[PDB]
Every structure is written in C-alpha cells, then in structure tokens.
Amino acid sequence: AECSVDIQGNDQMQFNTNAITVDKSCKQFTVNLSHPGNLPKNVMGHNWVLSTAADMQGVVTDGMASGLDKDYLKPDDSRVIAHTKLIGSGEKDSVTFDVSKLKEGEQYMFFCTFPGHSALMKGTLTLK
C-alpha cells in the first residue's frame, strides 16, 4: 500500500476489488495487476484501464475495434489516463501514473477492455 494497490483479474472475469482510493499526498500511484488463474491471454486476458466514468464506454467500444494485437485499446486514446498491458495466466504488469492528472471531485472508473469483460470487471477510483 502507500501509493500502490495490488489487484487480480481471475478466470471468472472478476477483479478482486471494486474500489480504489488514491491518497492525495502520493505524487504518483502504482497499480500492480496479476492474473492468478490458469486460462491464457487469448481466452481470459485482463488489463486495468483508467478513465473518467463519462469516457469508459467510448474507450471500451473503440478498444474492442482495435483488437487483439493492440491489447484491445485504441492506440494513443486521449481518454485513457493510465493502463496496463493485457496479461494472461501467471503474468503480472504494473502501471505508475502521476496523481496530478486526477481532479478532486471527478468520478473515475477502472475496467478491463477484453471483449465482454467490462460488464463485470469494473470499479471506481477516487482521490482521498
């Protein structure tokens, strides 16, 4: 903890948390994502992507259209504040982003953009 959180995406298309809080004193924040399941990336890949709650749907829709090879994210999507790579069973990836990119009193969402996963794999992030 302290300017970091560890999150897991499993073979049941679930993240193990629905809410992340970022302490306003952190200059940067790190998310460390792992996949504890046994299914591969092409079947059950997960990423953790952060955007405003208003932008989540356009990011998910354009992410599906970019496809597989682009980790289901539009290249240089300006609405994505930070994201990991798409990972499979046994893998891990971290992303560190500057907390100054987040406003107090704005709602943010984290989600996975693998096709169909965002319906269940999503949660809120808020500054504290």
Q: How far is the CB of 80 from Cu ion (least distance, A)?
A: 15
CB atoms within 10 A of CB 23: 12
Give phi and psi for 77, each to the nearest 5.
-75, 120
Pick 19 or 25: Cβ nearer its own copies: 19
**The entry of Cu ion, its own copies, none that residue 57 binds, CB within 5 to 8 Å by partner kind:** its own copies
Nearer residue to Cu ion within complex by CB, 102 or 117: 117
74 lies in the site for Cu ion, by CB under 5 A? no
Nearer to its own copies by Cβ, of 28 and 120: the residue is: 120
Binding stretches for Cu ion (CB under 5 A): 46, 112, 114, 117, 121
